[PDB]
Design a protein around this nucleic acid. Structure first.
Ligand code: SF4
Ligand code: MN
Length: 187
RNA sequence: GGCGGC
DNA sequence: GCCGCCAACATA
């Protein structure tokens, strides 16, 4: 039911901070390192994109990197298809859970995947928070949670704020969960 | 990105 | 240099 020229907006309204970052990085750089391609792609699949859309969404954005639209089908295409289970063993991979994102494959320079509340240093996170126009009160309330390593909670806090609600009404532990709950209130 | 093949 | 095959796991 979801369309491609709608994502940019969705990223702002329903994507959790992690997917939002990964999306912006993809539009700015017209590319993403493996770690981000994994987390983001499975997420996009989890929200609704079909294999036809996925291949289009990614090819389109990668041509702007000015690389061979052929050098794309060479490497990147096969892997996208294997994500939707259309290659090899044929496994329709479930998107990443928060705990996984938070405790594994920590990000390094050049990477944008991972969990902002966990992998972005307090000072950079603050700037992002502000960039999303989050009230300095909640920003402060988030940083606290972050300091107590309650990353997922801090993200729930972010939910409640960007949706103007008192209680998100669920415990967060999967990015696409954040998405759906958002879609519930907006759509 | 890793592993694997030439 | 060409290429194949993987990983995940919430979820009402
Ligand atoms: S809480 Fe889970 S989803 Fe919300 S940002 Fe941290 S990782 Fe991505
Ligand atoms: Mn590569």
């Amino acid at each position: 039911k979801i369309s491609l020229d709608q994502i940019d907006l969705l990223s702002t309204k329903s994507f959790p901070p992690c997917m939002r970052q990964l999306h912006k990085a993809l539009r700015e750089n017209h590319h993403l390192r493996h770690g981000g391609r994994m987390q983001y792609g499975l997420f996009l699949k989890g929200i609704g994109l079909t294999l036809e859309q996925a291949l289009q969404f990614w090819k389109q954005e990668f041509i702007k990197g000015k690389m061979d639209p052929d050098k794309f089908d060479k490497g990147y295409s096969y892997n996208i298809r294997h994500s939707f289970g259309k290659e090899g063993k044929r496994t329709d991979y479930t998107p990443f859970s928060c705990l996984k994102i938070i405790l594994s494959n920590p990000p390094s320079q050049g990477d944008y995947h991972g969990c902002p509340f966990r992998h972005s240093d307090p000072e950079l996170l603050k700037q992002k928070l502000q960039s999303y126009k989050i009230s300095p009160g909640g920003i402060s309330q988030i940083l606290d949670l972050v300091k107590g390593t309650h990353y997922q909670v801090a993200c729930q806090k972010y939910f409640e704020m960007i949706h103007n609600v008192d209680d998100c009404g669920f415990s967060l532990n999967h990015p696409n969960q954040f998405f759906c709950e958002s879609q519930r209130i907006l759509n």
